C-alpha cells in the first residue's frame, strides 16, 4: 500500500493500469501490474537506466508476491486518443513533424543501447500539454513477449508490425521500430491507419497491395523467410503520392525509406533525424 489508486487508466498488454499516488512522495504515477522469468528480471533492470526525455520514465520496479509492478511517469493522453479527437481537422503538420522528430530521438537513444520496442503503436505514444511525446513500454516485449491477445482477451494489433516479423523471422533488428513509426507517421498525416490488417495474412497482403509484393530484387532473402509462400499474389507497387497526400516531397522520401522492405535498407533513426524533412522542425503547443 505504498500507492493509493486514483483511477483505472485502462487495460494494458500485460495487465491492468492504474493512475496512483505515491503515499510518501505525493507523486502521481501510472502503475502497471504484470500478470517471474530471469529473462524478465534482467531485461526490466536494464530498462530502469534507459532514461531519455522521449521515453516514459520507468520510476521503479516492485517485485513482490507473484507479481511484477512497474511504476511509470504519468502522462495524460495517448496519441491514439489525440488522433481520434483530431479526426475532423487533422493534427497540424508542424505538430506531426515535431512528434516524429521527438519519437526518432527516443528511438535513436534506445537503439544506441541495443534495446528495441518491437510493439510501437499510437496507444504506446503519450503526450503532454506542453508539446512533448514519449514512448511507453519500451523494452517490455523482449522482457515478457508480445502475446496474440491481452490478459483480457483483446486482440493485440498487427497494424504496425514489420513485414519481417509477419514472415516469421525471429531476429528483430532496430528496423522493426522504424517500420512501426513510418506507419504511425502515415496515419497522423492521412487520418487513417495505413495497413489495418485483421489477421497476419490480411496484414501482409495490405502491405503488398500498397508497396508491391516483395521479391528478391527489393529484398534479398525474402523468399527464405519462414512463412514466405511462392504462391502469394503479385501486386504492383503504388506511388506514395497517392498513399499520403498532402505530405510534401521530403516527407514522402523519408516515409519511403522508413518503409523499405529489407530491414537492412530501411533508414535508421539517427539517419532519419538528419533528413531534410526536419530542416524546419519546431515544437508547437498542442490543443491539449
Ligand atoms: C529471420 C532471419 C533473418 O535475419 N533473415 C531471413 C533470411 N534473410 C536472408 O538474407 O537469408 C538468405 C534475411 C534477409 C533480410 C533480413 C532478414 C533476413
- Nearest atom within ligand 1 for CA of residue 170: 1
The answer on 132 and 26 residing in a single domain is no
Q: Taking a C-beta distance cutoff of 8 angstroms, is the pair 177, 117 a contact?
A: yes
The answer on 112 and 14 residing in a single domain is no
Q: Taking a C-beta distance cutoff of 8 angstroms, is the pair 31, 20 a contact?
A: yes
Test site for ligand 1: of 168, 169, 171, 217, most ligand atoms within 8 A of the Cβ: 169
Interacting residues of 263 by C-beta distance below 8 A, sequence separation 6+: 162, 164, 173, 175, 176
The answer on 53 and 29 residing in a single domain is yes
User: What are the grid coordinates assigned to 31, written together?
Assistant: 502503475
Domain that holds residue 228: 77-287
The secondary structure of residue 129, as a DSSP letter, is T
Please indicate the experimental technique that yielded this structure. Answer: X-ray
Phi, psi of 287, rounded to the nearest 5 degrees: -70, 85
- Ligand 1 atom 4, closest CA: 171
From 47, 76, 105, the end of a domain falls on: 76
Nearest to 133 by CA among 108, 167, 106, 156: 106
| Grid-cell match 541495443, residue found | 114
The answer on 142 and 63 residing in a single domain is no
The answer on 66 and 101 residing in a single domain is no
Pairing label, strands 125-127, 67-73? unpaired
**CATH code for the domain in which residue 139 is found:** 1.10.510.10
Q: Is 257 annotated as a binding residue?
A: no
213 C-alpha to center of ligand 1: Å?
17
Q: Taking a C-beta distance cutoff of 8 angstroms, is the pair 20, 29 a contact?
A: yes
The answer on 174 and 41 residing in a single domain is no
Test site for ligand 1: of 224, 263, 264, most ligand atoms within 8 A of the Cβ: 224
CA distance 71 to 252: 38
The β-bridge partners of 77 are: 127
Query: DSSP 3-state assignment of 216?
Result: coil
Q: Taking a C-beta distance cutoff of 8 angstroms, is the pair 28, 20 a contact?
A: yes
The β-bridge partners of 4 are: 21
* Residues in the ligand 1 pocket, defined by CB under 6 Å: 164, 169-171, 220-221, 224-225, 262-264
**CATH code for the domain in which residue 66 is found:** 3.30.200.20
Give me the sheet containing 58-64, strands edge to edge: 3-11, 16-22, 28-34, 67-73, 58-64
CA distance 184 to 102: 13
Q: Taking a C-beta distance cutoff of 8 angstroms, is the pair 107, 269 a contact?
A: yes
Query: DSSP 3-state assignment of 210?
Result: helix
CA distance 251 to 255: 6
Test site for ligand 1: of 163, 164, 178, most ligand atoms within 8 A of the Cβ: 164
Q: Pick left, alpha or beta for residue 114 (phi over 0 → left; psi -120 to 50 → alpha; otherwise beta).
A: left
The answer on 139 and 240 residing in a single domain is yes
At how many Å resolution was this determined? Answer: 1.6
The answer on 132 and 236 residing in a single domain is yes
Q: Looking at the chain, list the stretches that DSSP marks H as alpha helix, in order from N- to C-terminal side.
A: 38-47, 79-85, 93-112, 140-144, 163-166, 175-190, 200-211, 240-243, 249-258, 269-273
The secondary structure of residue 137, as a DSSP letter, is S
| Grid-cell match 520496479, residue found | 61
Nearest to 281 by CA among 84, 82, 51, 104: 104
Q: Which one of 119, 177, 198, 239 is the catalytic residue?
A: 119
172 C-alpha to center of ligand 1: Å?
10
Q: Taking a C-beta distance cutoff of 8 angstroms, is the pair 150, 156 a contact?
A: yes
Please give the full DSSP string across 230-265, using - where no structure is assigned.
TTS--PPPPPHHHHSTT--HHHHHHHHHHT-SSTTT
224 C-alpha to center of ligand 1: Å?
7
CA distance 73 to 58: 7
Axis-axis angle for helices 93-112, 175-190 (nearest 10): 170
Neighbours of 94 (CB within 10 A): 13
The answer on 191 and 72 residing in a single domain is no
Nearest to 135 by CA among 56, 60, 58, 57: 56
Nearest to 153 by CA among 11, 10, 30: 11
The answer on 153 and 248 residing in a single domain is yes
- Give the angle subtended at the CA of 123 by the CAs of 120 and 127, to the nearest 5°: 100
Please give the full DSSP string across 10-31, using - where no structure is assigned.
EE-SSSEEEEEEETTT--EEEE
Q: Is 197 annotated as a binding residue?
A: no
| Grid-cell match 517500420, residue found | 179
123 C-alpha to center of ligand 1: Å?
30
Structurally, the chain folds into a number of domains equal to: 2
- The residue length of the chain stands at 288
From 76, 105, 134, the end of a domain falls on: 76
Distances (CA, A) of 38 to 43, 48, 71, 81, 143: 8, 16, 19, 35, 9
The answer on 132 and 72 residing in a single domain is no
The answer on 87 and 27 residing in a single domain is no
Nearest to 18 by CA among 70, 66, 92, 64: 70
From 25, 47, 76, the end of a domain falls on: 76
121 C-alpha to center of ligand 1: Å?
24
* Whether 119 is catalytic: yes
- Ligand 1 atom 6, closest CA: 225
User: What are the grid coordinates assigned to 237, written together?
Assistant: 507497387
Amino acid at each position: 500500500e505504498n500507492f493509493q489508486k486514483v483511477e483505472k487508466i485502462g487495460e494494458g498488454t500485460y495487465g491492468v493500469v492504474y493512475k496512483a499516488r505515491n503515499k510518501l512522495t505525493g507523486e502521481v504515477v501510472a502503475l502497471k501490474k504484470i500478470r517471474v522469468p530471469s529473462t524478465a528480471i534482467r531485461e526490466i533492470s536494464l530498462l530502469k537506466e534507459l532514461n531519455h526525455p522521449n521515453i516514459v520514465k520507468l520510476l521503479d520496479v516492485i517485485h513482490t508476491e507473484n507479481k511484477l509492478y512497474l511504476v511509470f511517469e504519468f502522462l495524460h493522453q495517448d496519441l491514439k486518443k489525440f488522433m481520434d479527437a483530431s479526426a475532423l481537422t487533422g493534427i497540424p503538420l508542424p505538430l506531426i513533424k515535431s512528434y516524429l522528430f521527438q519519437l526518432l530521438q527516443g528511438l535513436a537513444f534506445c537503439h544506441s543501447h541495443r534495446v528495441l520496442h518491437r510493439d510501437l503503436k499510437p496507444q504506446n505514444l503519450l503526450i503532454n500539454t506542453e508539446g512533448a511525446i514519449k514512448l511507453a513500454d519500451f523494452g517490455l516485449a523482449r522482457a515478457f513477449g508480445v502475446p496474440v491477445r491481452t490478459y483480457t482477451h483483446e486482440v493485440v494489433t498487427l497494424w504496425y508490425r514489420a513485414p519481417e516479423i509477419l514472415l516469421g523471422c525471429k531476429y528483430y533488428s532496430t528496423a522493426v521500430d522504424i517500420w512501426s513509426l513510418g506507419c504511425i507517421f502515415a496515419e497522423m498525416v492521412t487520418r487513417r491507419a495505413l495497413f489495418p490488417g485483421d489477421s497476419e495474412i490480411d496484414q501482409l497482403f495490405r502491405i503488398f497491395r500498397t508497396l508491391g509484393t516483395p521479391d528478391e530484387v527489393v529484398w534479398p532473402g525474402v523468399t527464405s523467410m519462414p512463412d514466405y509462400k511462392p504462391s502469394f499474389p503479385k501486386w504492383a507497387r503504388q506511388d506514395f503520392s497517392k498513399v499520403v497526400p498532402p505530405l510534401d516531397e521530403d516527407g514522402r522520401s523519408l516515409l519511403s525509406q522508413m518503409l523499405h522492405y529489407d530491414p537492412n535498407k530501411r533508414i535508421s533513426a539517427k539517419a532519419a533525424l538528419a533528413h531534410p524533412f526536419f530542416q524546419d522542425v519546431t515544437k508547437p503547443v498542442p490543443h491539449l
